[PDB]
């Protein structure tokens, strides 16, 4: 019945397993029908007690049925005998029998270690990659829709070229793209490629993130906090309306997140937000002055995907 | 090697799987020679990464026979047939083939139910607990050393009647008792009556903890600054030598945690500090003016277990 993920959705990136149930469970109860996971953010088994509480509960008003699930096979699971078993793996952990989406996390194949480093990384702190033809990858996440395991694949951070590629040998066409879009990186020509051949797009770390201390670039925008305060909102909510009125599609999802209650539900009333034309211009001004892309595998890994 | 574990130990409560790995690997390299784990921590398979990594090859210095290993069975698992599946788990997550210690992780008994949750509460917010004789979880832990899978067992939290009464049960005896000791809470009488019983004893939250948001009730006393700031040292490392001098036997630890690698290198060199008479009468005093048991069942699970 879902085509594609509920608009607002939401995420557990870097939310420990301490609060990262509490916190699907107050998402899950505020409204929110959209889950973004991943394996390697070791925590899908607490968000897996979340789901299960509260779908195994006919008292909560939420079924399975009702809430999309996404998560990702991770970089050192390329070779195509692993992605299956990480697809059990991550289910499992979830308390799900189905994944509503699976995404490829990045385009770069990790080697798998004796000891089962995430981020095996060489004396230079340079990633450690093998040698798999992402077909071959994407060949596998293939067969978890053909055996019913999972009800969509996808990728993430895969720019123009690989999605063009993609395209010309995929037998079962990738949902979505999730990238990196928020007022300091709109990625327009990129969403645009996506949308234009067929593909939604979902919006990771869609109100700046928190990067490097780790810091949220937000709370320095007094663009967004101007028009946040004439309005009587806050900054993320601006940033999350400004995604939804830019790329008016059900095809287009923002995946915000927050391990505080309190934030989880003020976030969830971004879609009462009503943006002006002159809103959106000062906000589409932000990146000329200020234009940062976090999530950039040139730093952390030394691989410079986006270059 | 070891009969007891290492005085100065490194705890890993409230770490997340994201900075776990590399606390665990400071410490090791710092010289701390016992690790304290648990399954509810929600972290060991990030600790099993370090101690496979450290473990297999002699070139990082330190074999697995050098380390002291503790890990806990969860209050969900005190069903007999439980306890052997998760002690299995446990030492899958961290990477070992035995563990130098296993403890009973309370003398509570809580329900396993189909969603796993871990603190499975009644409508009132009290822990449901589950109809199981400590002794039966007992015979359970004793098996696990007539196999080889760990060396010792023991308990936490227990008080003098429950460690009587096991006394009086137990065909394998505990090797040890952790409890909460710190100088708001020096459970001097317990204490005394383990090592008196030929019982050790593990100090948990030496340092008085990050407990209700959290605090550390070690920055706000004047008396711990005062004898730092005298022998040019943090409160941390006094509190840490008050322990091992108040206590000087081999049967005492102490488990301070950091996930913070400064701090946790900083912590180790409580050992060259030295407390003169007037500073452990000093003190020793602190609980008569201010006494917190911060790790109370009382309060979170609404089961009065210290009363
Ligand atoms: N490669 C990938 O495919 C990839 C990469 C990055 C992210 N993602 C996904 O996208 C999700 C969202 O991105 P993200 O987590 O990077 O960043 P984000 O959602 O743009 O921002 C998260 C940060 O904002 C804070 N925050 C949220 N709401 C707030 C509010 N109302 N007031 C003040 N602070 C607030 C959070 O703090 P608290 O949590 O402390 O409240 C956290 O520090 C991730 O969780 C993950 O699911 C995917
Ligand atoms: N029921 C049980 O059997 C039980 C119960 C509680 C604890 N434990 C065990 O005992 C271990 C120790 O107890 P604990 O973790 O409750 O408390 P603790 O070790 O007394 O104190 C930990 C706190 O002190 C901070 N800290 C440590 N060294 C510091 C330094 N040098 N400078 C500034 N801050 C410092 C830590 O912050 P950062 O980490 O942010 O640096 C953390 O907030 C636990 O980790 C666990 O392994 C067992």
Redesign the interface.
């Known amino acids: 019945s879902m085509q594609y993920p509920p608009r607002l959705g939401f995420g557990t990136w870097?939310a420990?397993?301490?609060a990262v149930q509490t916190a699907v469970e107050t998402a899950l109860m505020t409204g929110y029908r959209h889950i973004d996971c991943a394996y390697v953010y070791?925590?899908e088994?607490?968000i897996?007690?979340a789901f299960?509480?509260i779908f195994?509960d006919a008292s909560s008003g939420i079924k399975r049925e009702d809430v999309w699930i996404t998560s990702k096979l991770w970089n050192y699971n390329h070779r195509p005998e692993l992605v299956r078993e990480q697809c059990k793996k991550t289910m499992s952990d979830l308390?799900v029998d189905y994944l509503d989406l699976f995404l490829v996390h990045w385009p770069l194949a990790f080697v798998r270690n004796?000891?089962?480093?995430?981020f095996p990384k060489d004396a230079e702190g340079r990633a450690m990659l093998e040698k798999v033809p992402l077909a071959d990858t994407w060949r596998a996440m293939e067969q978890l829709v053909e055996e019913g395991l999972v009800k969509h694949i996808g990728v993430s951070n895969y720019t123009v070229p690989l999605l063009a590629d993609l395209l010309n040998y995929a037998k079962i066409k990738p949902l979505v793209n999730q990238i990196e879009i928020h007022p300091w990186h709109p990625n327009d020509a990129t969403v645009k490629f996506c949308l234009d051949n067929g593909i939604g797009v979902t919006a990771y770390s869609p109100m700046g993130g928190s990067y490097a201390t780790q810091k949220n670039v937000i709370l320095e925008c007094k663009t967004l906090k101007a028009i946040a305060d004439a309005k009587g909102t806050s900054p993320h909510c601006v940033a999350l309306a400004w995604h939804v009125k830019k790329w008016n599609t059900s095809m287009y999802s923002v995946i915000p997140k927050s391990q505080t209650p309190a934030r989880i539900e003020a976030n969830f009333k971004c879609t009462e937000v009503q943006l002006s034309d002159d809103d959106m211009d000062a906000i589409n001004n932000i990146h000329l002055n200020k234009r940062i892309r976090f999530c950039d595998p040139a730093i952390f890994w030394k691989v410079p995907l986006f270059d």
Chains 1, 2 share one sequence.
Do not use: H, I, S
């Open positions: 870097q420990p397993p301490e070791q925590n088994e607490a897996g007690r299960g509480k195994k308390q004796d000891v089962g480093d995430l």
